[PDB]
Amino acid sequence: QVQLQESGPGLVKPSQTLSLSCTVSGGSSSSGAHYWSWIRQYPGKGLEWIGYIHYSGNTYYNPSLKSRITISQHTSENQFSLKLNSVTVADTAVYYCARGTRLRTLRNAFDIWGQGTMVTVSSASTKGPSVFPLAPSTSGGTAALGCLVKDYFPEPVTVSWNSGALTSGVHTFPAVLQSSGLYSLSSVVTVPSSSLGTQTYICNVNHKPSNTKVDKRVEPK
Amino acid sequence: VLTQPPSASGSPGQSVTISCTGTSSDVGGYNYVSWYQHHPGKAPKLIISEVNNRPSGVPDRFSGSKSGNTASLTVSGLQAEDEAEYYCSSYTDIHNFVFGGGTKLTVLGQPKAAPSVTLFPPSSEELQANKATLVCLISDFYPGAVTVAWKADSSPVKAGVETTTPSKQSNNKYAASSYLSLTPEQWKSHRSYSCQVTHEGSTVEKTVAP
Numbered sequence: 368q369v370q371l372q373e374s375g376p377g378l379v380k381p382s383q384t385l386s387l388s389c390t391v392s393g394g395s396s397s398s399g400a401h402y403w404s405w406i407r408q409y410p411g412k413g414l415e416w417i418g419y420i421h422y423s424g425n426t427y428y429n430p431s432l433k434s435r436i437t438i439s440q441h442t443s444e445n446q447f448s449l450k451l452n453s454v455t456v457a458d459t460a461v462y463y464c465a466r467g468t469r470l471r472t473l474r475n476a477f478d479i480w481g482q483g484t485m486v487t488v489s490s491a492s493t494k495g496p497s498v499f500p501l502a503p504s505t506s507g508g509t510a511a512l513g514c515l516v517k518d519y520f521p522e523p524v525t526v527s528w529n530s531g532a533l534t535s536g537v538h539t540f541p542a543v544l545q546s547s548g549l550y551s552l553s554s555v556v557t558v559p560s561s562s563l564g565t566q567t568y569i570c571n572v573n574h575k576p577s578n579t580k581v582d583k584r585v586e587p588k
Numbered sequence: 589v590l591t592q593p594p595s596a597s598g599s600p601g602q603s604v605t606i607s608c609t610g611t612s613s614d615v616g617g618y619n620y621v622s623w624y625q626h627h628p629g630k631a632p633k634l635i636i637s638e639v640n641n642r643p644s645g646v647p648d649r650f651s652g653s654k655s656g657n658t659a660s661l662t663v664s665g666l667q668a669e670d671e672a673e674y675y676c677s678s679y680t681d682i683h684n685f686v687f688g689g690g691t692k693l694t695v696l697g698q699p700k701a702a703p704s705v706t707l708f709p710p711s712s713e714e715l716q717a718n719k720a721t722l723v724c725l726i727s728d729f730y731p732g733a734v735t736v737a738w739k740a741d742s743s744p745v746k747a748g749v750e751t752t753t754p755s756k757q758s759n760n761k762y763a764a765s766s767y768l769s770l771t772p773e774q775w776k777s778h779r780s781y782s783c784q785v786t787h788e789g790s791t792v793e794k795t796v797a798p
């Protein structure tokens with residue numbers, strides 16, 4: 368059937384324009400019952416309908432974004448596009464294109480979607496992490512101790528413990544993106560409460576994009 | 589906007605209902621409720637439109653209905669492939685589209701597991717850098733959906749809250765984290781802070797104090 372496929376930049380800097388493109392494939396057939404739409408989905412957040420373009424090229428934009436957007440179509444390329452002006456970190460999201468339809472039984476539904484294209488907005492290019500200890504502070508006789516890997520860009524960061532000798536009870540969590548446009552993550556390991564006096568625990572943080580490695584020893588406080 | 593439960597689950601072969609609660613402007617406004625299924629990384633798919641119409645191509649196990657300002661998606665014989673994120677949508681008489689915030693529907697393939705929750709206060713070292721971060725780490729939970737709420741002296745905190753989507757661990761359980769970004773001065777300016785984790789209708793809470 369018809370398929371929609373998005374293209375995007377991956378990363379854009381604040382104050383710049385975000386340009387996305389949706390190519391329509393598999394037979395199309397231009398019709399006033401179809402509305403070509405953009406919708407974005409926030410990091411673990413809800414959905415926002417951005418606007419559409421329909422038929423002869425008339426547009427309708429979500430009133431809160433109206434002043435920053437242009438949706439246009441290039442039918443010779445079987446594509447339609449979104450320009451979003453002066454983006455900030457709050458514009459980070461997965462952007463989807465979708466076909467809305469007015470046909471009976473399908474009214475006001477989006478009956479075809481693209482896979483989404485992730486867009487990250489940030490002023491950073493390469494910045495290594497600050498590493499802070501999460502000092503141990505149970506029913507199973509264990510204590511959790513960790514490292515906070517803060518304010519780096521871009522992803523990814525890897526963390527091992529004791530040079531990778533400690534893998535048991537180790538969890539390295541997915542990153543959050545801060546309003547600063549910089550990432551933070553944590554790594555934790557669960558170890559015997561009785562060993563907190565005799566045992567050394569060091570998190571090894573590697574951020575290859577900034578060529579930085581940090582070794583941080585984590586003690587009781 | 590539209591209210592869905594963050595999680596729903598059932599074992600293979602069982603049936604499960606997912607609610608979507610709006611106002612009389614949208615759901616009950618008219619019959620323009622639709623539902624969407626989304627598998628990570630794949631195009632969302634329309635599974636129900638005009639409240640109760642199932643498109644050709646969609647498995648007969650999905651059915652929709654509505655009653656009040658509340659619409660519902662029922663999945664009948666749960667199959668592994670039915671595990672996905674589901675969203676409801678409605679047209680509004682204000683000439684716009686509203687969406688729910690989504691429901692993760694897990695088709696149980698192992699025992700439910702309660703999250704291990706750990707809450708760290710800011711390190712003295714971080715405080716020296718003029719930053720304060722509270723760190724709530726949540727691991728080994730299944731199904732892979734949780735709700736986190738932050739509290740400063742029993743009062744709900746919204747600002748400074750940064751929460752990850754759950755990610756699958758190598759044991760097929762899930763991990764997530766939530767951070768509360770504060771200044772050193774607001775850190776010391778409160779009696780205590782709490783991270784409250786809700787999983788499967790059960791709430792566990794950790795608390796720290798400066």
Ligand SMILES: [Cl-]
Pocket residue numbers: 602603
């Ligand atoms: Cl049942």
Ligand SMILES: [Cl-]
Pocket residue numbers: 739741742743782
């Ligand atoms: Cl409380």
